[PDB]
Amino acid sequence: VSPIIATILLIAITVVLAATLVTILGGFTHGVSNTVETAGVTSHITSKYIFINVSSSSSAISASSITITITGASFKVTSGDTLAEVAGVSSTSSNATFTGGSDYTVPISLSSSQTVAGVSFELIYKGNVIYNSAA
């Protein structure tokens, strides 16, 4: 009798270990994707505007998917921080897509202590910095 019953108990234990292992593996098999992007970007800064002109990019991406951050100044548009939003890009505009041939104008404001030589900005896509004016 007993060697067969002991075998049935060990099969029952084996299934629970396998089910446990499957939940451990689930912590590895997610959140990996191709996030690399690369663009030819040029820029000019003034007391009122930042100009951004794109010459080429690795892929064509929406101007709403790009986040812009700034230091030494402030945006004149206050709703948020996507490139499409601060640049005033309408959905019909040519500049709705970030690719070679797209140009943007961002309006900015300086305090009494701030100066043009102190201003810099960065463009971020999928958590990677794709441009930095102070490089």
Add this chain to the structure above:
Amino acid sequence: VSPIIATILLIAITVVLAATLVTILGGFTHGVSNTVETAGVTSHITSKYIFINVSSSSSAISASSITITITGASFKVTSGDTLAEVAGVSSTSSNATFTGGSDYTVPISLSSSQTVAGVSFELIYKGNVIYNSAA
């Protein structure tokens, strides 16, 4: 009579062995998880401040989850040693999340014998070193 009674005793013993084995296995089936993280980090050190600028990361993580340690100097903030805490990160601040585009300034103090060339620091997340200024 006796061969059946001996069989009943062996079943009773078998259950206690199986119950014992289950408690042995419990020492293996815990504390395994995916703790790997990887970031593009750059840094500059001065007699008053450490600057830390992040360009990309493997995942988006809270600045309170990262621990910072220092040698050759001391922090001007004394409450603890999380990155959010020593850098003075408010909960509304852009720099509340550690990702590309996040920048931090940490204020520090040197003794009469300490010098800038002697200072170094490390960032630790889930018990792994993710950055070391002296690498």
Add this chain to the structure above:
Amino acid sequence: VSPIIATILLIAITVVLAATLVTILGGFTHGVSNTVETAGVTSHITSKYIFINVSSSSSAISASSITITITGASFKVTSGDTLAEVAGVSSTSSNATFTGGSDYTVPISLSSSQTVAGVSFELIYKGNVIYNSAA
């Protein structure tokens, strides 16, 4: 008596499981081989002929092992689709081996609607495309 007999039955069952497992593994341990090839190839297309000139290759291979496919035109030789066959390569010919210094001429025919600008072709070896005129 019975604990020994139960043990003999469990050995008999164990052998059949092991024999079963061996037949499962046989579905993995076949059909893996090094099929990569790479060649410097140049080509010119006309209303009557395709010219193919080889400058180098990763290995020396038989012209009968290479398959050619065409669109926008048709071959003047109708027996099949190996490179040796459609190019009229005799077994004594220098061009029997695909390597640097081997040249081939393939004769072709166009319909009333087909034109030279529409023609393209590919070379295939061991199920991989090694050249494509429209790349």
Add this chain to the structure above:
Amino acid sequence: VSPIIATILLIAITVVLAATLVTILGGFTHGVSNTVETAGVTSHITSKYIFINVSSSSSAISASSITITITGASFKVTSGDTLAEVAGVSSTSSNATFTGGSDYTVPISLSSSQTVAGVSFELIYKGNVIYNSAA
């Protein structure tokens, strides 16, 4: 009586099988180690001498741990075949360690039929070839 006695016999058999298995495993769990080495080496050969100049190495190793073999010629030193030995390296010599900046001169002899164009040699460390003059 008998089901308990049969159980005691099966425990005695189980221990001998486990002890047998332990001796099988001992044939796998030995003789695995990191034996890889890699060096920038340059060499020049003449009718009387081989010159060997080292520019870099993966690790710093003793010149007595390296074995040299030769064809088309013979060594003027006859005691053995370690690099330190045939090159006449004293224990105080700079060239006692194989690293960037170490240079060696090995004296050789040719027969009436042998010629400089026929000579070649190899350096061997832990059973791997680390340099071969005829590569």
